[model samples]
Every structure is written in structure tokens, then in C-alpha cells.
Target: MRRELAIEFSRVTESAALAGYKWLGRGDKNTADGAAVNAMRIMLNQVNIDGTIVIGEGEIAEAPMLYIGEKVGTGRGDAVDIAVDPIEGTRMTAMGQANALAVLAVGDKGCFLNAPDMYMEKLIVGPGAKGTIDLNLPLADNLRNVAAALGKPLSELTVTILAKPRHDAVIAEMQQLGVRVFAIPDGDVAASILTCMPDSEVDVLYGIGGAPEGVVSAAVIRALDGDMNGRLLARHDVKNEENRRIGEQELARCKAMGIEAGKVLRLGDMARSDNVIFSATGITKGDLLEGISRKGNIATTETLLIRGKSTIRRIQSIHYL
Candidate 1:
């Protein structure tokens, strides 16, 4: 992919963020997501790549637009796989909370895992702890390894995880280990990205999150040269029909890729290429990036664009709507 393609893709996220910002605090997640999806679909069609939506909102039956297998962009240029979260934290955005972002990742064809929309256990850390921490290790051992890599005491290490009943034991173990825990209501992508930044207070991210978000994080993690490992958490026991359907699809995809859904997946297994592009526009202020700000007919947006490991750009632009 051309380096110039980085800026072009950033616009896609920026436009989606701008569209969704209007629905903030309106208490309507579907409307906000719809606005973002429409904006992204329109802007994506203008780009030159022949893109396929490998990971998107959901299958056609589950979502209205930007569904999996949907083709995007013009019918010209490089063939690439696209993974998008038009509004990563729709609930947070609707409630006017923080860490909401519009995000996407693009890579060469067959470079991205066709991960199903299901729960995935993830362990994410910065490049410094890349080779030291492993998902299969005991939680305490992984924390100790991360602390040693950063030359920080165990108590100084901060781990982020989603706040939920399933993580009650995980949080208790961290507390017993004398490590600080930061719990958030939503947006694991933002939490994972924060762990990759040098100045971020978050030392690592642990626990389960959406599998699609895992793949999207893989692109950014690869560009930052960080380490991330994930394994699908099947919900075969769930009684809901929707979950049963999603689980079947997830298992099928894993089988086709010659990978077991239960096995740990590294960055290479998730995003196969180092030639990748990641873009995110913040909808609300959080630990890593600032949210949208508007005045009169002008609106300012903050975007994070990563094109491989060598180029990481933080762009702040004012748009005249």
C-alpha cells in the first residue's frame, strides 16, 4: 500500500466521527451507528481501493449496512481486506461518555483474520513487554513479567479490564497481587491502544472482549510493534438463538483458516501482514486521544493514523461543515 493511502483512510474515520458526534447524549445508539455507517460508506466509495469488508457491523441479517462480506470503495486499485467499527462505543457515545471512537483497519487481501463477532480472551501490552508476556501464563506471572520489562514495581503497574461479573475473579486476583486495576464501562479498542503508548498510565490490558475488536486492535498493535494474544471464547452453551448462530459462523471461519478457535492467536495469526493501515477518530475524550470539539460552522477533530511501525501520525484538523 502507498504511504499516501494513510491520509485518505484517516478521512474515512474522521467523517464517521463527525456524523456520529451529532447523536452524542441523545440516548440513541442505533441512530448514532447508522449515521456513522452511512457517512463511512459514502466516503469509502470515493477511495480508490477495491475493498472487502471482512469484519464489520455483523452479517446481513444482524446489521443493515457495512455487514460482513460487503464490498466497499471504488472498483479500482489495490484489493484489500477492510475491518471497521463505525462507532466503536455506540452506547458510550449516546450517553455522552468517554473513549468512543470511529475505527477501521485495512490490509492486503487475505491479510486479516475473518474473526466472528464473539467473545475473545485478550492480553495486550506495549512493545517493551512484547516478548515477555504471554496469554497462557498465570495472571500474576504475566503481571510480574510486564513490571520487570518496564522496570516498575508490581504496585506501580496498572492493568485495564472491562468491568463485568465475569471479571470479578480476575479483578480480585490483580488486587491480591498488589497491582492497580482500571475498570471501564466500554471500548476495549481504546483501552488496548492506551497500553501501547509510552506515556500511557495503562501498563497492560487483560480479559475478554469482542473478537472483531481484537482483529482491529491487531492492526494497530502490529503497527506499534506491540504484542497481543487472543483466543475465541465460544458461547455454545448459550440458549439464545442469535448466539448459537454467531458461534457456528465463528467456528466455521476458524476451521477454514486452519486455526482452532480455542487456541491462542498472535498478531501474525490475526493480521497476517506488516503492510497495514489503522485509523481512528475520537468521538469523546479518553486516555489516549481527545474528542470532537465544535464552534460555529467549524468543528475540530483529533485522529490517530498508523501506517506500519515507522509512521504514527496524530492529526488535528478543523472541518468547515
Candidate 2:
């Protein structure tokens, strides 16, 4: 994608920030999310491209604008798929927090995962562990590799995970493996990025999160040379028509897009990649970003952006009345 075009994409999605700030720190998650989604949809409708939402909240009936299978742009370029997250942390925004952002990703046809909005396995790491974190290895070995790659002791390496009953076993195993565990309340997208960021001490993000965000994270990882591998897990017996017709459809698309499963990323893989960007402002602060904060006539928000290659980014937004 052209450099200007990349900036243009980010510029357009910023619309969500402007509108979403209104509900910052108000404690109304639904309202805060609606505001960001509305703004993101309006902005996407104005772009010039033939794009469909491959990863999003759900179907049109479930989420009006950023719904999976929803098309955006003017349908001018090569038909492509998009993965969007209108809001990453709604709880933070409702409590008058910060770091609420609207983010999106776009890629050519057969390039993005059309995963159902369900749970998925996520593996994230920072630059230090660039060549580490192999899926084929045991979880404990991967942890040790990350520690070795980052040149940190096992006790010092932190793994981020969502605090949930489902992850209790994993947490205990990590503890037994001698790695520090930091469980968060929400924002898996943020937790994934934390593994690599300088400020965040996290070295990995494991377990399930929003499948749509998984694609978005893959996009960003693609851009930044980070590694992310996610496998869609079927929640029910009802399989999606597209996924059913094409067994391992997501894997096929990933290979076609030049993303080598179980391998390191390269710049060549992401060249010419085009992705539609969408992120709703998150309310209620969490590990990923601070929610939104309202102060008299101004508001602050946090957002996350991931390209088709998993180039993870977090941006802070502030609005003035």
C-alpha cells in the first residue's frame, strides 16, 4: 500500500475517536461502543475500495456497520476483506479512562481470516523472542525460549492472560513453569501487543479472544514482523457456509496471502497488502488501553491498530469541545 494511503486509512478511522469520546468514562459501555461503531461505519462507507468485513463483531443483524461480511468502501479497488474492532476496551471508557481507539485492517481477497466471532488460540511475543515461541513445542518450553531470547530469567518474564475460570489451569501451569503471570480483565488485543512493547513487561499472550481481533492482530504482526498464529475454534455444530464449503478456508487464505504458518514473518509477505481499518473506542480501562476520560469540555481515548501483517499499534486520542 502507498504510504499516503496508509496514513489516509488511519486518518479516516479517527472519526470514531471524535464521536466515541462523548461517552468516555460515563460507565455506559453500550452507549460508548455504539458511538464508536457508528462513527467507524460512517467513515468506512466513504472510503474508495471494494472491501468486505471479514472479521468483526458479528453479522449485520448483530452489528450494523462493522458486522462480519459487511461491505465498505466504494468498491473501486481489488475486492478485499477487512477486520475491525470498533472498541478494544469498553469498560475503561465507561469509567472515565483513556486509551480508547477505533482500529481496522484490510487485505486482498483470500488474504484475511473470515473467522466467526468466537474464541481462538492466540500466541504473541515481542522482538526479543522473534525466533522463539514455536507452536509445535510445549507451552513451558516456549516460555523458556522467550526468556532466553529476551535474555531474561524465567521468573522475570511475564505472560499476559485474561483472568477467567477457563484459564485457571494454564495459569497454574505457567506458575509451575516459573514464569510470572499477569491476568487481565479484558482487551486481549492489547495484551497481545504488550508482549512486544517496551513499556509493557509482558512476553506472551495466550488463550482465546475475539476472533475478529485475532485477524486484526495478525495484520499488525504482519506489518511489524511480529508473529501471531490463531486457529478458529468452532463453538457450535453450525459451521459457517463459507468456512464449510472450503475446509481450512482460513489457513488457505493465510497461505495465499503469503503468511507462512509456523514460520517467521518477512517484509515481502506484506507488500501490496491492503486492509480496511476499524476500531471502536473502548470504554472502561483494561490492560490493553485506558478507557476514555471526560473532563468538562474535552475527552481522552485510547485505540489499537493492527495491519494485515500484525503490525500492532496503540494510539492515544484526545478531543476538545
Candidate 3:
């Protein structure tokens, strides 16, 4: 896609950009996320796609905006799947964080992962490490291959992991490998995304985390020609049953949320093989772009967008006059 095409999507980017710095150090995850969701959703309303909120924040009960199947954009163009992390780093935001972004990805038909808002196992690498690791491989071996491919001592390569107990073993192996660790309190969605950027130092990420985020991160990896593998991991055995029993809808709300309803979703499958387009506006500066800020009656913003298989960045920031 041309830079101009992405520029058009900037309307959505610009709106979501509002939630970036405003929520910084606010110490409220929900409010930070809620602000981003509302701002991004509002921006979506102005675009020209017959978009639906396929992967989003609220469940049916949490509705009012950006609900599943909700129409987005200006309601004037191709029907597409809309996925977003309005404020990807809510925790980071509350801590005056960095790398917080107003992120969203759009694709045709069954492109986005309708991953249940539950834990999942994921292995991800940017372009250089593509085909180096497989989802079925043992955690130990996967680490070795990634380290070897990068030509770095396993001890030197830093892997990003969420600060959760479930990842203790994964972390231990890294420590054994003499690998450095870069841990974050939350926001794996954006952290995993770092791998997709060639300039980013994040090598490989593995852990159990939100299924929805797995899909969202996959979208970026796919766009960057990077690799990502994920499998759903239900923490509680009864989760499958509990997911269906509530209102007792036969299809079950949970089933509806599962990405399997659409068959295998490959990297190219997103954006319907149209060389997938990805875009994000940094809300709070961190590993990615810096978040927007207001200075003397004007706001400053930085945005990033990409198209097709290009490894080079397609980013631009505009100053409001």
C-alpha cells in the first residue's frame, strides 16, 4: 500500500493517539484502556469501511461501544475485520510508561483472530528468525535456535516476558542460557510486536498470555514478514464448560470468540492476502514511537504504518499548525 493509503487510515490513528499521553501515569488501567477504546472507536466511525469489531475490549455485557459485530468506520466501504489494542500498555501508562500505543489492524472477512480473552502459548520472531523456531519445540531448544540464528550468545540475547508465575520455567531456562531478561509488568501485545520491527532488539518472546493479543501481535508479525506461533491454553479445566453455561446460548459466547470458527488463520490470510496493512500511533513513549503531547495550544503526534512485505519503516509525524 502507498504511504498515502496509510495516511488515510491516519484519521483513525489520529483519534486513538489522544489516549496515549493523557492516560500516562494515571494509575488506572481501565480508565486508560477505556479512553483509548472510545477514542479509537470514534475515529473508526469516520473511516470508509464496512468494518466490524471482530477483536475488541468489551464482552457482550461490557457493551455500549466497540462490541463484537459493531459497525465501524464511516460505514462506506469494503467489509473488514477490525482488531485493536486501544491502549496496549495500560499498566505502563499508569506508571508513566513507554511504548503505549493506540494500535489497530484491519483485514477482510475472516482475517483477525477471534481469540478468546484467555491465556495462550506463543512463540514469535521477526524476519531474521523466521522458520528458526516452531511452536511444538521444547522451550529449551527453541531458545537455543533463536540464540544461534541471531549469532549471539544465548546469554546475551534478551527475551521479553510478562511478569507472571506461569513463565517461571521459561525464565529459568533463559537465565541458564546466560540470556539477559527484559521483563515488563504487562502489555505483551506491544512488547511482542517489538520483534516485528527490524530495528528493535527484542529477539524471541514465549509465554502464556491473552489469546486476543496473540492474534493482534500476529497481525504485526505477518505485516513485517516475521513469524509467530500460538496455541490456546485454557488455564482452568472448567473454563470450556463455564464459557458456555452462562446464558446457555448453544453456540456459546465463548465458542463465538474462538478464532477456530474461521479455520486456519495464516499470516497471509490477514487482510485477505492484500499484503496486510498495519498502523499504530504511540500514546506513551517506550520501545516504540513517542506518545503525543500538547504544547501551547497545539498537540504533537508521531504515527507508524506499514504495507505489504517491506521491512523498512513507513513512519511519519505531523505537527498541528
Candidate 4:
């Protein structure tokens, strides 16, 4: 799509973020996300595009809102496939915490990988280290190669990963390899953006995260000229027995969908092209973008908007309620 759609598309996410901010600390993540989704649909329909939801909360069979195959927009302008995370950190916003965002990506038809919403192991880096990552290689080699590509020592290379029990060994091993690791407890999409942002110190984001989230991230990464590789994983392969039992069905679903688990997928396989538009509006304060701040009838917000190759802009706006 053209760059003209950048700011117009950005308002879609901003609406969701502000609506999500309204329900902060309510202890009801679902309702918060629901409110976000409500505003998102309204704003999206206002834009002049023929849009379809290719990836969302769940499948149409089970999900009631923003399910895959849902149509949006005013049915005019460019034909685009949309992937949205109305609120990536539902619980985070509910807890009145940091790092919650309303994120979305718009691209041409078939621009997104039809990845199942399951576990995916990801290796991501910015434009400087674009060709340096390979999921086929060991983490140590990838880290070394990335550091070399960026003209930095391993000691100065910073990697971000989720601080979950699954990352215990990955974190310690990175520390052992002399790379500084920044372990975050929230969504990896925010962490993924850090690698592409010059003001952010993160050089890489490596770990398992949601596949739908990864696909949306890949779109933005492509827009930023960054690189990524992903491998789909069954539930049984990652965690435990109970999860393994549930994962049995996940693997079957993968097979039914014809998606091969454990195959390394490069950047081109995910996002397709540079013609992409991505938007992220912060709901709670954290790195990357500031969250909404409100006292009575007025509020403030920060949104990261990117379109095409290099038009990256952070828009700060004041909202009067």
C-alpha cells in the first residue's frame, strides 16, 4: 500500500489503546480487550480499505470477535489483509502494569504467513544483522554472527528474551557466552521492535512466542528492513505432560492445516515484502513507547507508526474526553 495510509491506519491502533487504557487495573482483561476491539472496529470501518482479518484472537468457529476470515474497513481503497492484537498484554493492562499495547499490521493480499496460532521459536535482528541469523545453527553461533555483523563485541551485544521458565538455560547460556540478556516478562512483539529502534539497546530477540504475534511482528520487521526466522513447534515439544497431551491435538491441527512443525522459515517466508504498514499505540508505560496518561477529562498517548522502508515516526497526541 501507499504511505498515504500510514497515519490513517495509525488511528486504528490509537483508538484501541485509548479504549484499553480506560479499563486499566479493572482486573478484567477480557472486557478491556473487548472495549479495545469495539473501538478498533469502529475506527477501522471509517478508513477507506477493503480489509479482512487473517489472524486475530482465534478461529471463527470459537472466537466471537476479530476471528480469522472476518471482513473490516469501508470496502474501498486498497485490498489488504490485516493482523491485529487489540491488546497484546491483556493481563498487563488489567494489572495496571507496564508494556501493554494495541498493535496491528496491514499488507497486501497473501502478504502474511498463514501460521497457526501456536508456539513458534523466533530469532530476530535489525537491518544491520539481517542475513546473520539462521535457526538451523546453534544460538551461540547466531549471537556471535549477529554481534559481528553489527560491529560489536559479544559482551556489548544485547539480546532480549521472555523471562519464562523455558528460558532459564537460554538466559544462563547467553550470560555464559558473555552477551548481556534482557529478560522481559511480557509480549515479545515489543521486544522485537526494540531491535529495530536505534534508541533501544536491544540487538536481538530470541525465544518462543505466539505465532500470530510473530507474523504481525514480521510485517513490521519487514517494514523496518529487519530480519527474522521462525520454526513452528507443537505444544508437546516445549513444556510438560499435561501440555503434551493438549499438544497432541495441536500437532494434529498443524498436520490438518498442512503446516510442518520444526521447519525453519526465513523472513521472506513470513512477511513477503517491504510494502507494509504497522502501528502500535502504548496503553501502559514501558520502553519503546510511553503509555496513556489521564487525569479526569484529558489524556496523552504515544504511537509508533511505520510505513514502507524508512518512514518511522513516533506521534505524541493529547486526547480531550
Question: Which candidate's lDDT is highest?
Answer: 4
lDDT of 1 by residue, 101-189 (tens): 99989898998888877788999998888888777788899899999998999999999999987789889999999999998888699
Candidate 1 lDDT (Cα, whole model)? 0.88
TM-score order of candidates, top first:
4, 1, 3, 2
Position 189, candidate 4: lDDT: 92
Taking all chains together, the TM-score of candidate 4 against the true structure is 0.96
In model 3, where do residues sit more than 4 Å from their true spots? 1-4, 237-274, 309-316
TM-score of each: 0.94, 0.76, 0.85, 0.96
Q: Report how far off residue 30 is in candidate 2 (Å).
A: 2.9
lDDT by residue (67-181, candidate 3, tens digit) is 7678887877777788876777777777886777777777666777666666667778877878787666687788889878878877777788887877787788778868777
- Using TM-score as the measure, name the better of candidate 1 and candidate 2: 1
Per-residue accuracy of model 4 over 123-161 as CA lDDT, tens digit each: 999999988899999999999999999999999999999
lDDT for every model?
Answer: 0.88, 0.64, 0.70, 0.89
Across 148-205, the per-residue lDDT of candidate 2 in tens digits comes to: 8888899998988878877888899999988889887766765676665688778788
Question: Of the candidates shown, which would achieve the greatest TM-score relative to the real structure?
Answer: 4
RMSD of each: 2.1, 5.9, 3.8, 1.4
Q: In model 4, which regions exceed 4 Å deviation?
A: none
